[PDB]
Design an enzyme around this catalytic site. Structure first.
Site: not given
Lengths: 175, 993
Positions: B686, B780, B690, B345, B301, B298-299
């Site tokens: 367009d 956190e 394409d 294009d 992450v 935990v510390a």
């Protein structure tokens, strides 16, 4: 990945973690200077005394009698040490948690403090200060006994510290 | 799978008709026999597209819960769960600790997952707008009687018949036609009808008159041709199969994050196991040593982190939404800032997609009108006699007409019924001349001979408005060389004059030049019919010439052209400066394509291909060296022939390139070529042409309005606006954030250290635990969150547009130097600021620091009611616990105080707080206040001592960490300074993010 310079990373942390631990000590050592040798800045935590018992889970001194508070003086270094007082169905010694300058006040279940000690001076001021029988005819059962202290200065905290001014334990002598 | 399609197609178009018949085993006249038709389906299998395989199962949601990161929190939640289980060996407290934590974890997976998924749940949908373009039935001839059948039945071999207004059902060999024209934009991206005929016009099958293709519609006329190709065999359906079932793949931001989880899991695990082996030296067995390993999750992450990055991305995205730049995907916010090459294009993307006039030659001088939409140029000439008499023919000898729909919109912009050429003329005269209807009104049109293909010229006889004449005027136009043959005189200025031989060239001269431009040229002449031959009344005879066709007064020449949106040429040059390469890719012909490339700046002034050099230089093409010719233009016909390792080399070799007359696959090929290069490409397009490209690009941008449905589905983004400019804004919106994200990482991570160290000191020192698992979640989840997110508002320390694109592999988002900085230096100052507060609260209470060591077993021992402090006083279980709980709360605050410095510091990487201003960011200042207020709440507000074990603090307690926060501000402030100005060496190359 330094293929030289590590060296430039070594001299670094040694005289910068260095510098940081010599600032941190710097502030501890300032803080420690502003506190009494003899008494704590906040007594509040300890505010009401708890009760604890021995049940592991004297000469010098002065003869005394049951009486009124014996003030010793100020909490100070220039009188030497402040003079303390003296005093098959198991034995449980209860004792009241010391706390410095506190004056406790006073002036059917299954079958089964003298003011003169206070105030307590606090350890610097009093090294060998000493602080102050279920004969029952029921064997062969587990009794619960709550012992508790009474006074104006003493409070209980049912919800928290069950110790606060009381005990809770479960003897048992099987013979 | 995907490869074969990449190559061009190979054909039958100058096979003879009978021959074709004998291949297919079919009858020209009568067509397939019903029998033979059916049998040919089961063999081939319908004339339809395979249900877009890739059917993203709604279950997708679950793709979000996983990722890599969510995996570190799942592992982590599950580790918390296993430890609780391992506890279960006794009598334990985790009823508030470990099970709560592992829940907070998975809950952070789930939640972040759902946010992401939602936001993402808005974009998908391609194959849906692609088969919004499909006929239905068709009319085949079988046995020898015809009949509209379900399309899907069609096969190879059968006779099909198409008239004006249909869709070609399938690829077809034209056996018979006439006047049939087709629309082949699907292939070329170009709408002008093409003529179909039973003779092969040319080698290239894309080029021959005789083949008509599916995905095309027969414009007019009527015709029959033998199905060469059905289903996913047709030229187009190959292009089809080649897209949708395309595979999206990871973004860079997503990649940088998965790299980040890699360095994170790399420390979490290596401290977590190292906390095993140290533990074990000490006197803990397999039991305890294992506990701490996983405890150490935990510390390590940051729970913190996933949600900050998302909010940060989300926040940036709604600044861009305000910019009229929509973003379908959260990850897209960054991307932009990597795009190397853009394959664009031309028509409808770079260009407005429209037509207009160009210039006129009259008065022996070439005239340059204004071709721009909102007409930003200059009025070229209004004075001449010559001009009006030109203006007259252009308005009168003209059958066109503007749609009602219109008076609101401007004249360039309004739709006109007629052919392209005549609409040009109407608009030209509408804009400089006044209402055309006025003129036509005025000079009523007596008789006119429509533009034949034969005559190659169109004439009209008008009764002249001048009331004092109302005699007859003759106006004509048509092929320039056909007009001339047509004249005896020239209106040069006001008067006529003798089409000598000199002006026969000059003309000749203007004609050839304006031709070169790649502009369409018309010729104009008129004649004041002699009154005394044509009485007021007179018949003319559009039938046969009872009036003069020859010896007329040549007025002048008019041509035309085509330009691109407005922002484009600029939009192009920013990009290059950005140091992106721009590559045109068009269905369109090469003269046009290059002229636009030159306009927009894809091609820069006297850049040169090899064929331009050969001109000036008067020389052939060989003795030109290809190298010299930076620029290139490659016609699709030549592209077909080359190997993909000849494409790649063109692509290195030239900095400005134009691929013209490219097919969709080719557009596909180019983009793949560019990617082999390992460059991030944006295709901007367009049309339905394409589609593959767009589908193929790292990021496919589609013009919203103009864009075919097909490009839009294909595309990641859509420029609602059509606004090409938006593409530059899009590219910028993916840099700043990148840097500001590192600041928020540095910020968050720093706090991890003050969070870990208490636990370790606990196990090592044997002291009462300084900081609790719940305390951590407040930092956190709570306090850190505003200030982290707070960083996204930060501005640029330097003009960001100035620096080159980041090399993706080399310069990661999270690198060692961040860790070092966060963990090694800053953090660590924070830890001490934390621990300080711990000693102060205990010391105050009676427990001096020296006495603290080795206490934990007595202090944790539930049975000693008796614990003796330094003074000698005895504390119950509960009473000494309240004290430790107070510490937990103070430590929590320490960090916030220290986090204030970390916030300020983290606002800039290089720049002092002084140049920046730590001041103008209002969001950050709000985070400092909306994080203190949080702390103070957790501490002060009742209920908090029982629920989260947070106890009230004395005023004194706040100020413990204050020397520590100050030192951090200062320490960093000094480091940067010293960075700024040795920019080459040591501070910069260890600490600089």
């Amino acid at each position: 990945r330094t293929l030289s310079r590590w060296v430039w990373i070594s001299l670094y942390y040694v005289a910068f973690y260095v510098v940081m631990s010599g600032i941190f000590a710097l502030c501890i050592y300032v803080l420690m200077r502003t506190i009494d040798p003899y008494t704590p800045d906040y007594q509040d935590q300890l505010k009401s005394p708890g009760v604890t018992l021995r049940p592991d889970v004297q000469e010098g001194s002065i003869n005394c009698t049951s009486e009124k508070y014996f003030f010793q003086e100020s909490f100070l270094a220039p009188n030497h040490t402040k003079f303390s007082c003296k005093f098959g169905k198991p034995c449980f010694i209860i004792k009241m948690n010391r706390i410095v300058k506190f004056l406790p006040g006073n002036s059917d279940g299954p079958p089964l403090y003298s003011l003169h000690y206070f105030p307590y001076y606090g350890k610097k001021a009093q090294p060998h200060y000493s602080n102050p029988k279920l004969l029952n005819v029921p064997r062969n059962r587990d009794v619960v006994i709550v012992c508790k202290i009474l006074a104006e200065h003493v409070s209980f905290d049912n919800p928290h510290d069950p110790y606060e001014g009381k005990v809770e334990f479960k003897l048992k002598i099987q013979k | 799978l995907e490869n074969m399609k990449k190559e061009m197609e190979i054909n039958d178009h100058q096979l003879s008709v009978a021959e074709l018949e004998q291949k297919y085993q079919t009858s020209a006249t009568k067509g397939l026999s019903a029998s033979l038709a059916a049998e040919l389906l089961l063999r081939d299998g319908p004339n339809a597209l395979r249900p877009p395989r890739g059917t993203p199962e709604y279950v997708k949601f679950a793709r979000q819960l996983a990722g890599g990161l969510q995996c570190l929190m799942w592992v982590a939640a599950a580790i918390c769960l296993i430890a609780f289980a391992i506890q279960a060996s006794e009598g334990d407290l985790t009823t508030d600790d470990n099970l709560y934590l592992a829940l907070a974890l998975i809950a952070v997976v789930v939640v972040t997952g759902c946010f992401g998924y939602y936001q993402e749940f808005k974009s998908t949908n391609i194959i849906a707008s692609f088969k919004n373009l499909v006929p239905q039935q068709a009319t085949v001839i079988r046995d020898g009687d015809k009949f509209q059948i379900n399309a899907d039945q069609l096969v190879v071999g059968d006779l099909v018949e198409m008239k004006g207004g249909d869709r070609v059902p399938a690829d077809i060999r034209i056996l018979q036609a006439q006047g049939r024209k087709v629309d082949n934009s699907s292939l070329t991206g170009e709408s002008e009808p093409q003529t179909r005929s039973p003779e092969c016009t040319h080698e290239s099958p894309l080029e021959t008159r005789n083949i008509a293709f599916f995905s095309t519609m027969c414009l007019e006329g009527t015709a029959q041709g033998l199905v060469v190709n059905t289903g996913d065999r047709t030229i187009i359906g190959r292009i089809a199969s080649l897209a949708s079932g395309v595979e999206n793949e990871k973004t860079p931001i997503a990649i940088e994050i998965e790299h980040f989880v890699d360095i994170i899991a790399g420390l979490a695990i290596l401290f977590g196991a190292t906390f095993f082996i140290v533990a074990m030296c000490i006197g803990y067995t397999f039991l305890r040593a294992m506990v701490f390993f996983m405890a150490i999750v935990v510390a390590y992450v940051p729970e913190g982190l996933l949600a900050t990055v998302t909010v940060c991305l989300s926040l940036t995205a709604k600044r861009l939404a305000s910019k009229n730049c929509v973003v379908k995907n959260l990850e897209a916010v960054e991307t932009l800032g990597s795009t190397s090459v853009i394959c664009s294009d031309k028509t409808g993307t770079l260009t407005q997609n429209r037509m207009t006039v160009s210039h006129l030659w009259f008065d022996n001088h070439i005239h340059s009108a204004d071709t721009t939409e909102d007409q930003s140029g200059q009025t070229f000439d209004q004075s001449s006699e010559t001009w009006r008499a030109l203006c007259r023919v252009l308005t009168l000898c003209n059958r066109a007409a503007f749609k009602s729909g219109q008076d609101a919109v401007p004249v360039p912009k309004r739709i006109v019924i007629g052919d392209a050429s005549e609409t040009a003329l109407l608009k030209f005269s509408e804009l400089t001349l006044g209402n055309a209807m006025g003129y036509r009104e005025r000079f009523p049109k007596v008789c006119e001979i429509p533009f034949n293909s034969t005559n190659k010229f169109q004439l009209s006889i008008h009764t002249l408005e001048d009331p004092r004449d109302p005699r007859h005027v003759l106006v004509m136009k048509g092929a320039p060389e056909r007009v001339l043959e047509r004249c005896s005189s020239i209106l040069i200025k006001g008067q006529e004059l003798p089409l000598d031989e000199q002006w026969r060239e000059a003309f000749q001269t203007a004609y050839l030049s304006l031709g070169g431009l790649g502009e369409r040229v018309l010729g104009f002449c008129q004649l004041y019919l002699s009154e005394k031959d044509y009485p007021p009344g007179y018949a003319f005879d559009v039938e046969a010439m009872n009036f003069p066709t020859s010896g007329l007064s040549f007025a002048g020449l008019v041509s035309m052209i085509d330009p691109p949106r407005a922002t484009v040429p600029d939009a192009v040059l920013k990009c290059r400066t950005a140091g992106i390469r721009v590559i045109m890719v068009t269905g369109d012909h090469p003269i046009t394509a290059k002229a636009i490339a030159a306009s927009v700046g894809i091609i820069s002034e006297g850049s040169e291909t090899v064929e331009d050099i050969a001109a000036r230089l008067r020389v052939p093409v060989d003795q030109v060296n290809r190298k010299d010719a930076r620029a290139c233009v490659i016609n699709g016909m030549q592209l077909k022939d080359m190997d993909p390792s000849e494409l790649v080399e063109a692509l290195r070799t030239h900095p400005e390139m134009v691929f013209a007359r490219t097919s969709p696959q080719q557009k596909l090929v180019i983009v793949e070529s560019c990617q082999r290069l390992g460059a991030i490409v944006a295709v901007t397009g367009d049309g339905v042409n394409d589609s593959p490209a767009l589908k193929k690009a790292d990021i496919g941008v589609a013009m919203g309005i103009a864009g075919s449905d097909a490009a839009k589905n294909a595309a990641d983004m859509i420029l609602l606006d059509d606004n090409f400019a938006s593409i530059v804004t899009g590219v910028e919106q993916g840099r700043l954030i990148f840097d500001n994200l590192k600041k928020s990482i540095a910020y968050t991570l720093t706090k991890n250290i003050p969070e870990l160290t208490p636990y370790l000191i606990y196990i090592t020192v044997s002291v009462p635990l300084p900081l609790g698992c719940i305390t951590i979640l407040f930092i956190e989840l709570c306090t850190d969150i505003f200030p982290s997110v707070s960083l996204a508002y930060e501005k640029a320390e330097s003009d960001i547009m100035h620096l080159r694109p980041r090399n993706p592999k080399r310069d990661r988002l999270v690198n060692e130097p961040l860790a070092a900085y966060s963990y090694f230096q800053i953090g660590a100052i924070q830890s001490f600021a934390g621990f300080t507060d711990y000693f102060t609260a205990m010391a105050q209470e009676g427990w001096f620091p020296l006495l603290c060591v080795g206490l934990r077993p007595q202090w944790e021992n539930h049975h000693l009611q008796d614990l003796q402090d330094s003074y000698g006083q005895e504390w119950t279980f509960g009473q000494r616990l309240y004290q430790q709980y107070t510490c937990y709360t103070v430590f929590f605050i320490s960090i916030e105080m220290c986090q204030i410095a970390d916030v300020l510091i983290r606002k800039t990487r290089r720049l002092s707080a002084f140049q920046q201003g730590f001041f103008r960011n209002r969001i950050l200042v709000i985070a400092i206040v909306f994080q203190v207020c949080i702390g103070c709440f957790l501490c002060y507000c009742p209920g908090m001592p029982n629920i989260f074990n947070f106890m009230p603090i004395r005023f004194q307690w706040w100020l413990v960490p204050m020397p520590f926060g100050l030192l951090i501000f200062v320490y960093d402030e000094i480091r940067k300074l010293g960075v700024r100005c040795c920019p080459g060496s040591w501070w910069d190359q260890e600490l600089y993010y």
